[PDB]
Amino acid sequence: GGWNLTVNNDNNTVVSSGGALDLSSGSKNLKIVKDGKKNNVTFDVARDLTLKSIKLDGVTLNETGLFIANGPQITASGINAGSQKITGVAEGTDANDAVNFGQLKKIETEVKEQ
Amino acid sequence: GGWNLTVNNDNNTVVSSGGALDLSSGSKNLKIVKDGKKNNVTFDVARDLTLKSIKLDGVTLNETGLFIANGPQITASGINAGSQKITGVAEGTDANDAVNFGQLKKIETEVKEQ
Amino acid sequence: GGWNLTVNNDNNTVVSSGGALDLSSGSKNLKIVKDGKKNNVTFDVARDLTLKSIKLDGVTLNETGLFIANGPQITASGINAGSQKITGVAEGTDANDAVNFGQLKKIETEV
Q1: Quick check: C8 and A18 CB within 8 A?
Q2: Are residues B61 and B17 in the same domain?
Q3: Same domain, A1 and A46
Q4: Which superkingdom heads the taxonomic lineage of this protein's source (chains A, B)?
Q5: How many angstroms separate the CA of residue A75 from the nearest CA in chain B?
Q6: DSSP H helical segments within chain C, as ranges?
Q7: Which residues of B fall within a CB distance of 8 Å from C87?
Q8: How far is residue C8's CA from residue A5's CA, in Å, rounded to a whole number?
């Protein structure tokens, strides 16, 4: 006595009378806490994770960046707007700011009589 | 010789002498592996997760996209700049590249003579 | 009793005959479920997480936004395109839409 342990319905491993079982974490992403006074074990996910990828339906975040299926991609090579409009853009003020359509139309109306 | 098991201080049950306990993963997001050679069970977070949402204070990543609270968002429908400028934009040269303000100013300038 | 329980090979205690062991989660981010009176326990990551940060090599997601090392960032201050082109922009039609180079060239040609 002697109880049987299974994991994911694998085979019995006996934990015998006077025997032992060790529970361990594979990485810093999973915390397992126990002390020497009580049997109690607490498991948790780290609040700062290190991951290879995350899938959220058509949204993927990975080591290269953010990808949305049939949508934008954001990587170290830059922003791909996904063949979609970019909306909510404040007017550009510096040479290296994006311009919005209101700015383009102002210059169009000027150039036609300037 | 039995022993009593609770999970989150609940669902109290006896694991009797000769009885059995299974520990399983609810999904691919959490890996659990037994090594019966040394009576160890290792637990870890998968490095590739499938999730519904992540909240980091005002930042949300979910199945629709990336959201900054009251600010920019990136979804399949496109990028919303949040009524802020888009900075650090290089000059467009292909049809679907964004235009920066320096390009608009160059065209405004070149039509002085013409 | 009894059998010996360690975590990461440390903190041994004896789960004695007639003793008790509790397995609990430390936060809402980890789900541990016992199947009632059944001796099976399931562990999983919550599908909705609350985190401080995630690092994926040079990509960081945190409470400020999304950052790519040597690349763009997206925060409450706005989007920085990383001193690089923005590609794949559909033509703007409303006042606050971005405009693409084809639109700029169209107006250059018209004059």
Answers
A1: no
A2: no
A3: yes
A4: Bacteria
A5: 13
A6: 101-110
A7: 94, 96-98
A8: 18
Q: Which of A97, A101, A108 to mutate to test the interface with C (most CBs of C within 10 A)?
A: A101
3-state helix, strand, coil in chain B (%, to 5): 10, 55, 40
Give the closest residue to A16 by CA, choosing from C2, B99, B44.
C2
CB C18 within 8 A of CB A39: no
B82 exposed, middle or buried (CB, 10 Å; 0-12, 13-18, 19+)? Answer: buried
How far apart CA A11 and CA C30 sit, in angstroms, is 26
The resolution of the experimental structure, rounded to one decimal in Å, is 1.1
Q: Which residue has the tokens 């999304």?
A: C66
Contact between B64 and B73 under an 8 Å Cβ cutoff? The reply is no
CB contact under 8 A, B107 and C102: no
Parent domain of B43: 1-50
Residue found by looking up tokens 């975040």 in the block: A61
Identify the residue whose tokens are 């920066």.
B100
What is the CATH classification number for the domain harbouring A97?
6.10.250.2120
Question: What proportions of chain A, in percent to the nearest 5, are helix, strand and coil?
Answer: 10, 45, 45
Could you tell me if C22 and C33 lie in one domain?
A: yes
Strand pairing partners for B49? A54
**How many structural domains are present in chain A?**
3
Q: Within 13 Å and on the Cβ side, how many CA atoms surround A66?
A: 33
State how far the Cα of C22 lies from the Cα of C73, in Å rounded to an integer.
44
How many Å apart are CA A28 and CA C4, to the nearest integer? 24
Question: Cα–Cα distance between B33 and A8 in angstroms, integer?
Answer: 8
